[PDB]
Every structure is written in C-alpha cells, then in structure tokens.
Amino acid sequence: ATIHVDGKEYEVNGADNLLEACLSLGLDIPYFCWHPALGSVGACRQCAVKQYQNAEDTRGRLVMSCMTPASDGTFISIDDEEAKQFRESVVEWLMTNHPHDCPVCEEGGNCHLQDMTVMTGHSFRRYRFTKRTHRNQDLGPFISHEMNRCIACYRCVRYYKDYAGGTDLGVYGAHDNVYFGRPEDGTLESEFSGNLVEICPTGVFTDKTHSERYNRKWDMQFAPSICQQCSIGCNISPGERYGELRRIENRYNGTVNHYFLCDRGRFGYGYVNLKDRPRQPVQRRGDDFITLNAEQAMQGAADILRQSKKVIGIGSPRASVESNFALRELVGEENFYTGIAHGEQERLQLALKVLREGGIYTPALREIESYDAVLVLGEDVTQTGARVALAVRQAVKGKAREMAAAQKVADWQIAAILNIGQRAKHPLFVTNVDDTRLDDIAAWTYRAPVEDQARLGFAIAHALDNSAPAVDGIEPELQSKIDVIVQALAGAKKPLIISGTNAGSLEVIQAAANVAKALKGRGADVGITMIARSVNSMGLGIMGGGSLEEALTELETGRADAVVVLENDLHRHASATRVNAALAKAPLVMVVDHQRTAIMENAHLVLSAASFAESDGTVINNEGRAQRFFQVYDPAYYDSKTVMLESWRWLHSLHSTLLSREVDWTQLDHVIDAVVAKIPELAGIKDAAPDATFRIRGQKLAREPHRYSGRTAMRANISVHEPRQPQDIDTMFTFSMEGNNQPTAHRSQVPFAWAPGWNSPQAWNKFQDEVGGKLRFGDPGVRLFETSENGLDYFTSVPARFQPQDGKWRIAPYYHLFGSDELSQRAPVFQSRMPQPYIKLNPADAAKLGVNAGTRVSFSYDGNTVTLPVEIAEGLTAGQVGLPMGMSGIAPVLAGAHLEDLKEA
Amino acid sequence: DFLTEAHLDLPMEFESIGKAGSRLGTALAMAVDHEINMVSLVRNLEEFFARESCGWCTPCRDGLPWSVKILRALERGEGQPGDIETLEQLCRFLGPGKTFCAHAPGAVEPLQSAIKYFREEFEAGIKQPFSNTHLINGIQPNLLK
C-alpha cells in the first residue's frame, strides 16, 4: 500500500495499521498500549496523528495510528501542531498522578514512559493538585510491584491473560482507581510472568532478582548469549556489573523467542553469582588442597595423564559443542563417553534420527504458532520446554484468528478477534501421566502411563494410515476419543506433533514418529518437535559417544586409570553410589567444572571452568539450530587471582601440553574449524556467527552502552592505576563501549537494544526490518540439518498395556519449571519458588497402603531408603508413584524405573 | 450543551438544536434558574462524569478529574490564572474522536457551553495568583516571563 506521511510517499503493507507501518519506516510516533505481539486496543490514546482523505485537505481528523489501517491513499501528519499538542496533553494527563519516583525506580533509564515524556517534549507541570496513590501487593520472589507508577495502559493484563493464558492477573477498580494485579497476595503462578517487567512500560512490575543488586542500563555490560536452562535455546542478553551477572534481558530473535522468555530462563541465572564456584585450578595432595595457576595445572595434569595407560572422557549435555569436542579430541574417539545414561542416549538418538532422517520438517519456535492441530505425546511441555507451550497457546488461538480474518477483520484488531472467536479454538490433545498446565486450552487430556500414551499414539497412527502397525486391546470409549483425535488431525492443514525424551520412554517417540509419518502420507503439512532435556543435548547426540554406564564399567574394571569429567555432576544420569565407587577406585579424576558439584571430593584435580556468562561457545537447541553464545565479562578484571577459562581452552591447552609439552591457549575460531574439519554433521556451526575478524566499518561491536560510567573509579579500591580493558580475541565483540551498536549495522548478533530517544525494550523496533517481524539482516543461528528427501519406516514395536505389578511401583516423572534443571535449582532465588519434594500417589494406592495426604513414606532405590511426604494425585494412574525429577536426590534417570519397599515410615 | 433564553424559541429537532451548538439528546430538558451558580452546577456535572468513567482510555480517565479539581478550586474561590484556559484545552482535547467512546465529549459539552455563555462566573472564582512550586532554600528559581 501507498501512504503519505508529512508529504513524503511511503510503500507500506496494507494489512498493518498505521503505527507499525510508520515505526517500521523509522518514523517516531509515541505509543504505550500497543505491542507488536499483543495487538491494538486503542487505550492510551498516545499514538494520535492527523489524517486527511485527500491530498488537498486542511482540517483533517485526529486518529489513532494503532487503530487505523495503512490503506492506500491515506495522508497522515505526525508532526502537525494539533497532533503534537494532543500527544503532549496525553503525556501530561499521565503525568498528573505519576509519583516523583524516578531516582528510586528500577525502570529509570530503561523506562518507556520516560522516553515518551521526553519525545513529546513535555517538561513543564501546570497540575497543582494531589496525586492518587495505591497500595502494593506481594507477587512472589520474582516480580516486585509498585502500583503508583501505572499509567493504565492494560499491556500487563492483555499479555498475561490473552497471550500467556494466566488466570491470577486482572484489572480491578473504577474510573481512575484502576488496579492491576492479583485479587489477593501470592505468587504469580504463570510460567511466563517474568515478561511483565518488559511488557510494562513503567516501573510497576520490576525484576526483584535484579532489584536486589540493582544497576542502571547504561552501567550494564551486555552480551548476546543463549539460555542454558533447557533445550529450547532462547536468545538472551545477560548484563553484568562489578563482576557479577546482574540481569537477563530478552534478546530479540524473530525466529526463536521473539519477545518472551520463561521464568526459569529469566530468574534461574543466580548460579553464576554463587560464591562456592571454583575460581582457580585446585589440586588435592592427600588432605591438602593447593591452588595452582594455569601453567602449573597444565604441566601437572599432562604429567599424570602421560603417566597413565588409558584416559577416558565423560562429557555433558550442559557443556558447549567446542568443550565436548575438545574433550573428545583430548581423550580420543573411542575413549569419549557422553555423560547421559544409556536410556537417555537411546531416546536422544531416536529423537535426532526422527528429526534429521524422518522426512518431516521440524518447525522453528515462531513457526509453531501457525500450526492448526497440536498433539503432545508424553511431553510435559510447560515444565520442560515452556516457551513451546506458549507458542502452542498461540497456535490454539489461531482458530479465532482465522475466523475473524474470514469476516474482513484486520489482524491487529485483537479485541475484535477475541470477540468473534469467543471460545472456539484449534484442537489440542495432550497426553501425560497427570494433568498439565495446557489443560485449560487442550481439546483433550490423556492421563495414563507412558506405555498407554505410546499405545494411544500407535492407535492414532494406525487409524490415520492402515499400513501403520495396529494395537489390539483398546477400550471403546478410548476408541471414540482416538477417532475424535484422528478426525481432528486429519482435517487439519498444518498438524503439529510434539514429543521428547523427558517422557522416559522410547515408544512414545516411536508413536509420535509414526503419527507424523501417517500424517505426511496423507499429504499434510505435518511438523514434528522433539523437546530434549539440556541446552546442548542435541549437539552431544550428534557428536555421540558411549553412555555413562560404559565409562563407569571402564573405570570399575580398571581399564581406565584416568577420567576427565567435563561439567557433569554424574549423579543426575547414574546412581550416586556406583559413581562414587567408580571415581574413588580410579587413581586420577580430573573435573572441569564451574559449579561446586559433589564429585569434587574424589577429584584429584579440579579445573575452574567458565559458565555461559564467562565463556564463548556454540549450543544446539532442540530443533537443530546451532547458536553461538558470547562471553559477557572477563572474570579476572576485578578479581586478579581468578584463573577461570573456557572449558575448550582448558582441554585444548591440556592436549597441547600432553603432546608437545607446551601450553597453548587457542582461539575460538580454531576450535570451531577443528569441529567442522573433524565432524561433518556439525559443519553448520561455522556459520552460526562470524569470526573474530568481523568488523562493522572497521570497528568491533560494543558490549556496553556509550554512557558506561565509573571507568576510572570501578577498580580504584584495588589500584588507582586503571588497567587496560580486557581484550576479546575469541569474538568480534569488545569489552568496552569503543565499538558499534547501531540499529542499522550489518550484523545479526545484537548485544542489547538502544536507540536515541528509545531507552526501553521498545528500542528493538529500530533493530528489525519490520516491527514484530524478523531481525534486520537476518536472525542469528543457522539450522544444522535440512529435511530429508525420504523418511523412516513405521516402528512396529508396539508396547504392551501397563499392568500394575504388586510390590513394584513404576516411577512417573513430574517435571517442574523451577526445580528440574541442574543449574537453575542452585540459584538462591529459586529456593522460595521450588515446590517441596512430594511423592504423588493414587487415592486407591494410598488407601491400600494406609497413607493419607501429608504423612511421610520411605522407599529404597539402590540402597537409599529416602523418605518423602505424600501428595494425593487423582489423575495419576494406579500402580505408579509420582516423583519430582531433578530435585535433591531424585535424578531424572529415575523416570520409568521401579520402586521396591514403599512403606509408611 | 447549555443554551440560553434566546434559544428557547427553537424547535426540538436534531438538526435544529444541532445547528445552534447543542444536541437534542433525549429531549428531556432541564432548566437552570438565576439562583443556581453555574460553576457549582458544572462542578457537579463533571464530578458525575469523572466518577462514572470506565477507566479504559487516558483523556477521560485522567483529564475529567483535572477539570473536577479546577472547578472545585473555582467554587471555593481558590482559582489560579490559566485554569479557564486549561478547561478550554480540556474541552478541545476531549472532543469526538479523541477518546475511545463518546462518554467524554458529552462530559465536556456542558463545560465549554458554560464557559462560552457564562464566562464571568468562572472568572470570578480566580482570586489567588498562580503557584505550582514552593521555595527550595539554596536554589534560585527560574523566573519565566
């Protein structure tokens, strides 16, 4: 479409309103209530522009650009006198009751309201009367509430209810006494409530975790990184100050995680700032714990490694691609073992084979919001891959979107779309061991053991395509529900099947693959999505290796007298007693880790590795996208005795000292090129980010804003002589503001969003080709594999029906967004959010055992008689015990296992 | 809109009352005698219109109480210079199309009609000089002319 802004002709998209069309062209219109993801509601009345219908028109009409379509032949004026005075008056009306709170506000310097007050040019106060006040609510450990700063723009409630699907946030009150919050005090139990601190243009909802150790946005040193708390791989902007990770901001990736994170990835970063982390190489001599620098650690480690007959390496899915590859190239191809168990590795390799060999296109996370009918098999998505559950909610509301689009209603008229699509929504069928958080929008929820979920998946695949193997023994009511699912999936245009390795069963993934194959055989645009466990599970599966049990028996039989463990606690994937015995029997345990794990008591040498905030690397997410994360800060700038290096740097220098007796600190691009040379399946990680020689017109990319303060005083307590800024030889970024962060720079890795006049997270508008669309000059990260020309065959191994055996109890996994991650649970702020360890029981099984809700029963697994209190679960099937995976003492490897001697004690 | 005695010889149609700068409305007219102070009447009207706002959109929600407080100041004789101009700007910026619904244009129609026809009653409530600030000891204030 063609519009005329201030006499200048512009070519815009006619399906967009005037606000996003003009913001895409670089025209600054003030706005509060409009968001690119939420839609247009016309509340704040800030986006006023003067519209003319003809080229020869003098009077015009003040309209809302967010509510006015960008049709062909509209002549709008933004900087007309009447429009500017009205926008200034709207800012003034918002300023009548706003508190004098900017110095004591966490949103100061990051405030959209401040930016829009300055942009309209209102700086004189003529209001002389009183300002209304509000009491504040306790919203939990994550979100701090300050209701006086609200401008009643309704972004919070629109996001929290119409987007995130939350139920405990709302609008209350009246004429000018509007309150935004909960009906009482309590924690916001939505898994995406952390996005309120960036959705809210004011300082009402603030990051309490950042408010504990608060610094302003200009004082933050930012980097582009990837969230390491699960497999989705959302792009984040970690920002630090004074040597500690202060905040995790959302980093816009129009392909993956555009505007929203989950609460685990936004508030689970506190393990980086733990004081028990290793900061030097520490060597154990008997009972003494001596501290070495890097060179003596390398020389001693290489001496003992040369004095051994075989060295094995146990990687981890928590480590990056480069560190696992450096371990593999240090110990050899045959001596490298993945740190996961045999069953976890089998499920992971099956999921990878389905993804890159099944012939079915695995969608990106933004593309999940366009699929019609969603079938989740086995996965508890909202607790393991929560952002995928958010995109599933969007795909479910796609039915109301298409129904309103059938009535010539614009895409951005979100209120009219929700009015037309009252409760009609796209079909969602979730299967789990219990009730999920998607059950409010699910067309059906199947509460059954994983064998029965797999059998239901195989029955769906057989009913969709008769060539699929049949399962006999299905009840007629279950058959009716199955044919309902089949009629919903067959009538869909873009069906989506979501499974994963967290269900603890191979047949669930096989059934999901068979359903996807049957949907593809009918000529449908089927997509499949596997949810892995850790951040780099897919990279570890692609690189491959032996299981943890093979490494454990290699250490136990004595063939391996030297074990190098890379960022693994080894109690998460195997029993603690067997691991402890194997590591105590081995005469050399050398652990490269950045968190104080339990196997460091037996470790003969500990290498203080760097976490994601202090290391560069590559991670492969659940859809096979190689994403590069960059270092945020140098740990040794403030604390001079800190010897903390990248794990791939540790292992590369260790291998160099092993071979040539010389210590060699490599570069990130050298290790990347080594991965591309040795592993052809990981060849796409070279193009994930450009190398360290990349420049924007000769200068590097700045990690901190141009108004970074305290340079000559932040280190003056140590020494009055300011040292050189740390040099980044690994990446194209610099640990200084002497660099480039323009919105029009030809790059894909943006550390943070700032524009002149745009200090809020609304500054991401300047960094996109169109607002709410893709990032300018493409999104970061590339896909490792394409969709294959041919697919797999039908998995004929249909499992038998789950029969509850007497005495033995099948362990049903219960994943928690706060608690089931290895590193997020070490954050001190997650202690007040993690649920108490409760074993879930059927009413019938608890009545048989004589247990009621609340009391404690004891169960023994591998000689560990541990006692948990009982919570009654109605939806759990009989014969199973519900256990929380990832908690203290309950490994995720316990899923699907047996449980003997379950007695009340 | 308020109308005067000269508007009494006017037929009660939509276009006839609309041409004379008012609205037919519900055709249920209300008479204001000479004993009724018009500033108090408009204050009562704006108090009703501000307290019956829904709070969805900014101009009505955060500008009707401003007019209410200005009229409370004018009722008590504590009006300050610029208050009537602020009321006129509020009437101009709360008209049709500026707000989300039509509650606020109908709210501000009696105010502009009363200012147009009975300005001398609104000017009589301005007694004290304009003062938005207070003296901060140690800082010389900027004396704009």
Add this chain to the structure above:
Amino acid sequence: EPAWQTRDHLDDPVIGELRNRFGPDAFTVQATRTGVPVVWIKREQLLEVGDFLKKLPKPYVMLFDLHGMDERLRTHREGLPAADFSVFYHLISIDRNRDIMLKVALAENDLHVPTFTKLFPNANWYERETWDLFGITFDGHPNLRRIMMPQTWKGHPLRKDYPARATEFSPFELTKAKQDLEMEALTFKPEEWGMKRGTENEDFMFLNLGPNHPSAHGAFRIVLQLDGEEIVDCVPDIGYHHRGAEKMGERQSWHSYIPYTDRIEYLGGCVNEMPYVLAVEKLAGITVPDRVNVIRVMLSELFRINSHLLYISTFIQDVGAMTPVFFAFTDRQKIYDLVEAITGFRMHPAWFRIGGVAHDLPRGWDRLLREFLDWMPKRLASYEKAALQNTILKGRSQGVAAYGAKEALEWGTTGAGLRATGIDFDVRKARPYSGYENFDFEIPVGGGVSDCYTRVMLKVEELRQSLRILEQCLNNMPEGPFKADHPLTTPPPKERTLQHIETLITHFLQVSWGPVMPANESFQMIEATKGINSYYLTSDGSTMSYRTRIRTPSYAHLQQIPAAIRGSLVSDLIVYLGSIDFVMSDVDR
C-alpha cells in the same frame, strides 16, 4: 522566523555565480543550520572553484578552516553525495561579510585530494593535520608529515574505527628502548626540511626554542637555524599539547562536553564556552532570552579582560620589565573574585548550559562588579604610563615582526593582528551573536602595519572597550529567567526538577543518556580573546556529537610565524612570541 532554521542558502549571489560559471549540474547544495552556504563539489573541480572564489569582484580572500570528516558511520545523509570520507574548506569574504563551505567527497580507497596550499598558503598545517588524523593524502603537498602525533605513530586517530580512550590501549610503559626510539623520533632532522645545515664560511646553529623555554607559551618547540644571532629559517614544531578534544567530542554527550570546551583556550573560559553552546542551541532550536545573553556577554567580557591582562603582562615581561605582571595578576584576582562569586570556579567555570547558564546571579554580584570597574582604569593607565610608553619597550616592539593586510589574509590571521593591519572585521559587529547589538562599543583598528606594539595597544583598547561593555551591562541587566523554556534546555531548572515529575524525567534522561539533538549540521563563529573561535558540530541524531571541529586562531598565527620572522634576530622572535597572544591548548586542541 528564527535564526536557527535550516536554510538552503540559494539566495546567496555566490551560489548564482557558481551556477553561471560551472553550470547547474556541477555541485550540490546542502541545507544546514550553519548559516553558511554548503556546496558539495567534485574533487576534479576543487582548484577551479577555489580560483573562481579567489578571483571574484569581492573575493573570498581567507581560508578559515580546512579539515576532514569520517562519514562511514553517518546514518542520516539524505540529500548528500555518497562518501566514506569528506574534506571541508571554510572560506571567508570580508568584503561581502560572507562565508562559504566547500565539501569534497572521497571513497575509502581513493583518499587523495589536490593540495590547497598554492591558493592559500595557510593550508599547509591544515592538510598535515588532516593527513595525520584522517589519513587523507594531499597530492602536491610539499612536506606531508604528522603534525599532532609523533612520527612513530600507527593509525589515524580521528577515524571512527580508532579507539578513543587510553584504557583501550596498553598503559603507557616508558622503557629505555622506547625512550631512545621516541628521542630519535623527536630529534630534528634538517635534511628532511631542506635546511642545508652549512655554509662555506661558517656552520649554521640549530637551536631548540622550546618545549622548556620561558619564551614558549606551552609545550611546543621552534627549531631555529641561525647564523650568529640571525634567524635563517624556522620550523615551529607543534603537536606536543594534543589532548584529542575533537575525538573527545565524539566521546561525550552534548551536555558533558562543556568542561572540555572550557579547556580549549584555558585563558578564555566562558569565551570558549559560548560558541559551543550557541551551536548546540542552533542544533536544538533554542532561542535564549535577553537575560541569558546579557549574563553570557558579562562573563565573556570579564574573561576577555582577564586574558588581555595576562597577555599584556606577559608581553611586558618578555620585553624585560618584570614588575607589572604582579599588578596585572592582582587585577586578575579581582576578576577571579567576581567569577568565583558567580560561577563557583576560577579559571575553567563550565557555567554555560544548553539554553542558558547553570545558576542565576547570586545576590550581590553588582557590588563586586562595581568594585572591579572602580579598581581597573587607574591600574590600566598606570601600566600604560609605566611600561607601554617606555622607549626601550617601544624599541623592542615597534617595527618588530611587521606584516600588512595581505599577509594577514593569506595566513588566516584574525583578532588583533588583522585589525592592526587596518581591516575592520570583528565578529561581534559583522555577525553579531548573543545580543551584542544592544551594547555601544568601538572596534579599534590599526594603521596598516601589524607590529608587536600595534597588536599590544589594540588589545589595550579592546580591554577598555570591554570595560565599557561591562559598565553598560552592569547599569542595564534584565530581570528574567536564566534558562530557556525549551524542552531541550539541559539541564532543566533545579527546583522544578526537585518537585515536578515531568522536569525530573527530563533531567533524568538529559544527564544520563544525554539530550537527543536531531541530525543536523551547525556552526558558530565568535570573536575569542585571541582571535576567532569557531565550533562546527555534526549531529547524527544521537545524544553524542558525530563530529566536533574546533577552529582556533593561534593555529593560524603559529603557522604565520615563519613568514613574519625570517631574517630577523632571536630577540625579535621573543617579542613576536610574547605579542601574538597564543596558548598551546588553543593550537593543538
């Protein structure tokens, strides 16, 4: 219509003459807020355009400025030719009282411009500076070497990819090898300058006058080739006082750069502050009220009297009389008492703001102004009758280092020298800024010869006229605001900031991120204490300056130095150095 509006400048007759000479498709006209016609011309026609401007009926006889600009990072270049680098030439015609700014666009690989030294001899140091800081080569230049950086310097510092801060590079480690290498670099090599270090009869004497000399007014060195006592040739070596203030202008916000403007000419103070804040107000679109103009005129005339007192005492000291410097610095202490009362600081006040001044005048400033105005003229008459009417001082001064109007125009000489040549060109009258039209004062001019004595007596008359201006402004000071009511006035008034939320928001975003001045080019030229000081500010629409070009008169005077003292003795050079009114922060910036 306000004077800060973006004017296309197609009504200037010079534009019409250029159209009728070179055709209508030979150049582009850039609409700026400089107040000067900006003409983008091709590189091939640069010398022809310069010759045409030099051969006009009322010609552009002076090269005011010549410098480069890195346009690789400039996002808003609508209506401009495509360029990675650019070179601008600011020229003045005194007869028309007009300026022009010619801009030449250069690609990143083809960074060569024809030399401008044949048309204007003062282009030599400007082209050396442009090569040193931007890497732009000038073809046909006689000796293109580094003038601000030492010869063993890698990279060009004013390029956008060069790091601005010292903390980016390694800390300064002075070793024996580095000391020896930099001492060999600092050693004068006469074969490079063609000095011809010998004669058949006798040998020439190569003497370093400076950095450590009482006659040198800073850290710079003149290398003198001598026979006996006579000077054969001089090489004034500058760059020893380089603080990187333009790169610092690219590094600070608009508000936070004001103290750095204060240290450009450290005897100037508010006189250094005025052109920068006026150019920023042109960028913002701020028209300051009358009281702001009168206060700024007050402080700049006070600091002009301060600088002239120091200059006269310094000249008398270098002539040989060591007494009047004590009394002149006592008068400087009286001015410092008034300035400490008003601004709170002695010598670098940093008191001017965008849209006004930092505070209002304190209660009782007129008492100290009256005290100084009563104390001054008797002391000045005593200085005159004691030292300036001394026949030994006249013998050391009159006829020493004399040049006419042609040498003053070809070398860009401004200030007291240009008026001492008889050319009545003062910025406060020709292009009146800050409301100088409301003050009755005279402009002293010379008889046609710019002696040391003539320049000193002209500065004495300028001091007397500044006393007259101070008396007029003391007797008539307006009662209004000390800050403008513009939203971009940085910072806003303090009490409204302390008790209003709009003012608090504006203050919060103006002192932290900086005021957002929209993308435009601005220029302000003022009459400094030592000549003409100009600020040329290119804004990219951000909160920091994209380009800050500072033109100073002491640069031109020090470049004029070899052409006016060649063939004289060293004593004439000492008197010439004392009678130029230069500081070296002014030169090297």
